[PDB]
Structure 1
Amino acid sequence: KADPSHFELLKVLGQGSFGKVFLVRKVTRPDSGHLYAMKVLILADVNHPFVVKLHYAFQTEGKLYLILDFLRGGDLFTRLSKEVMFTEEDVKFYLAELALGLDHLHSLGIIYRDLKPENILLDEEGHIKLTDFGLSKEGTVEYMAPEVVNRQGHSHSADWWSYGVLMFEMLTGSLPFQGKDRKETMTLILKAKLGMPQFLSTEAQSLLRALFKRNPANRLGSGPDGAEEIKRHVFYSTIDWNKLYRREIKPPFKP
């Protein structure tokens, strides 16, 4: 049965505001030799095509180990940093898959508080995998929804706002609301004052305005059909969700 000695450390992939992550290799059968991402430290075991998979979970005194998929494709922030902005084609694909994974987490009563390009990883194929979720009861200020800035609540709706921020950042290379310091940024989010860059298609602009509604109740995704509201938006017209789910759609970018 399970034990940290069953995994040899290869490299310290990194560390966040909630632990450290290592690239490990299991030395015990039946998956001996297999590479995994080990995190050392709230529902953590989710099964979905676009949500990172938890393979093992054990507690070594003082800390809890989490063995997850090792995603080789890096993160969206890193790729954004290099490309400075994605084409709408690429954005539509990444956001479509994120929509499915996000809606699924929601069904499980999970709020994706830390939604941002940094937490969206790509596998060797190019399909995304959401990571660092699991919070049911609760960061990067630029991605905070207005009801969250004003501590007026934090529901599934807040995730759709953040989803809109991610779309804007991937399409323009810039954040929609940002000031000189955290305080100015929070104040800018509250006004929900937004200039639409002119190179954005009318479909993209429409989806963005629907997502950036100050009131969580009028924001796209706030029922009745919930997530279906967004999946049925004209921006995703050319998207076949069935095949997307089956990872049938060929990703724009490959690593």
Structure 2
Amino acid sequence: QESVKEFLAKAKEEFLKKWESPSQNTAQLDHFDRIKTLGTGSFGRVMLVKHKETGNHYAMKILDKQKVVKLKQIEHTLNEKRILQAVNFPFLVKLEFSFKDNSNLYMVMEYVPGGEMFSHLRRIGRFSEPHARFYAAQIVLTFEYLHSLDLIYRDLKPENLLIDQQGYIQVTDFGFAKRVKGRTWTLCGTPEYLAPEIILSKGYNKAVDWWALGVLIYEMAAGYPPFFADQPIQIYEKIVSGKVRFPSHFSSDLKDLLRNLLQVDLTKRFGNLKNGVNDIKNHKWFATTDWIAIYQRKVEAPFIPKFKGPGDTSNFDDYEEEEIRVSINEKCGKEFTEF
């Protein structure tokens, strides 16, 4: 255990140094060629770009400052960039550059051509338990790392997990990640993945990430999430009820772990007890997991995505290609001074 303790102490030291003195303004837009839109949202988009001098490909997240303000995401976007530039773990995507202009904020990250877990899971239908367990182990270690830094992730779902060339996970999208000691209160995240204490407007803590892991494991192994309905309010009723139904093909060990992660009483939920993450790591469902070998990326992956090279976009979907407009006048300068 001393080995883990010393690893996490060094991790916190290195995170805090970058957290206290964040990088800023480390590239500009005209250093890149635009290739393709990879995803779109209410206040931004993600683009495949190529750096004109090195030839390297990157995923560039572009946020419209005016829409960020309207949709009340200012603090969240400042969190996202400050955290991402400060972390370092094998299963977290690396932020390579950031900058802003009159209209937009930009985060330039490593490009992962294998695509999102969401697409692979819907294509295959459901993952076997070994396959789901390989991914789950990476999330457990990633949350052990993040939580030790007093970070809550708050957006675990298959769309945010990219599959790399070795078949390992890269967590992307830190839009709701926050540094907090103790409780926080914001309603955010995707309905199917919300813990009961979020739905009920409580002051909640890192236990919500462990709940979301239970939802993820269930969805990976079943092919659909445990709480599903046409309207968010119907989903929320199922989440708070304390009732889940398991497919008969689930192993007994999987059901037992899920009852302890999908525990409605946050004071009894695995990951939030006196024994912390070890209640999860030592559970029978993980008995075949060599935690060190997973961290070192020495385990042969269940699945290697098919792709032709570092610029291949075949595992991403097609979107309308819209302009990236940069106003002649500065927008929202004060709000985003620290970015």
Q: Which range, TM-score by smaller chain?
A: over 0.9
Please give the alpha-carbon distance, in whole angstroms, between the structure 2 residues aligned to 1:229 and 1:168: 18
Match of 1:248 among 298, 301, 313: 298
Structure 1 equivalent of residue 6 of structure 2: none
Matched, 1:16 2:47: no
Q: Which runs of 5+ in 2 are unaligned?
A: 1-25, 64-78, 306-339
Deviation at 1:131, TM superposition (A): 1.1
1:116 to 157, 160, 166: 157
**Deviation string, structure 1 residues 111-159 (Cα, Å, up to 9, x no partner):** 1111101101111121001111233364321111000110112311011
User: C-alpha distance in 2, partners of 1:252/1:38?
Assistant: 29
Render the CA deviation track for 1:202-250: whole Å, top value 9, x for unaligned. Answer: 1111110111111111000003232222111111111111111011111
**Corresponding position: 1:80 with 2:102:** no
Letter of the 1:211 partner, please give it: L
Q: Which residue of 2 aligns with 1:36?
A: 58
| Alpha-carbon distance change, 239 to 193 in structure 1, aligned in 2, over 3 angstroms | same
1:50 aligns with 2:91: yes
SS at match of 1:36: strand
Cα distance in 2 for partners of 1:56, 1:107 equals: 25
Does 1:25 pair with 2:50? yes
TM-score w.r.t. structure 2 length?
0.72
Per-residue Cα deviation, 1:157-180 (whole angstroms, up to 9, x for no partner): 011111100111111112211233
Q: 1:197 aligns with which of 247, 254, 268?
A: 247
Q: Give 1:225's match in structure 2, choosing from 275, 279, 296.
A: 275
Say whether 1:162 aligns with 2:205. no
The whole-number CA distance in structure 1 between the counterparts of 2:150 and 2:96 is 21
* Identity of matched residues, %: 40
Alignment partner of 2:178 out of 124, 135, 141: 135
Take 2:148 and 2:105, find their aligned partners in 1: how far apart are those partners? 26
Letter in 2 for 1:19: G
- Count of matched residue pairs: 252
Shift, 1:98, TM fit: 1.2
1:18 CA displacement: 4.6
Instruction: Give secondary structure in 2 for the equivalent of 1:223.
Output: coil
d(CA) in 1 for partners of 2:142 and 2:211? 16
In structure 2, the partner of 1:105 is 146
The alignment partner of 1:24 has SS state of: strand
Greater shift in the superposed pair: 103-112 or 71-80: 103-112
**In 2, Cα distance between equivalents of 1:122 and 1:109:** 26
Q: 1:3-25 CA distances to partner (integer Å, 9 max, x unpaired)?
A: 11111111111113452100011
1:62 Cα deviation after fit = 2.4
Aligned to 2:30: 5
**SS class of match (1:48):** coil
Which structure's relative contact order is higher, taking Cα pairs within 8 Å and 6+ residues apart? 2
Q: Which region of structure 1 is more displaced relative to structure 2, 70-79 or 127-136?
A: 127-136
| The structure with more radius of gyration | 2
Report the Cα distance in structure 1 between the residues aligned to 2:172 and 2:27, rounded to whole angstroms: 23
Provide structure 1 residue ranges, at least 5 long, that are not aligned to the other structure: none
Rounded to whole Å, the distance in 2 between the matches of 1:122 and 1:180 is 29
CA distance in 2, matches of 1:222, 1:81: 31
**SS of equivalent to 1:23:** strand
2:19 equivalent in structure 1: none
Indicate the residue corresponding to 2:202 in structure 1: 152
For residue 217 of structure 1, give the secondary structure of its aligned residue in structure 2: helix
* RMSD (CA atoms): 1.4
- Paired letter, 1:120: L
How many Å separate the matches in 2 of 1:153 and 1:211? 19
Asked whether 1:125 is paired with 2:162, we answer no
Provide the residue aligned with 2:135 in structure 1: 94
Equivalent runs, 1:229-240 vs 2, <5 Å: 229-240=279-290
Report the Cα offset of residue 108 of structure 1. Answer: 2.1
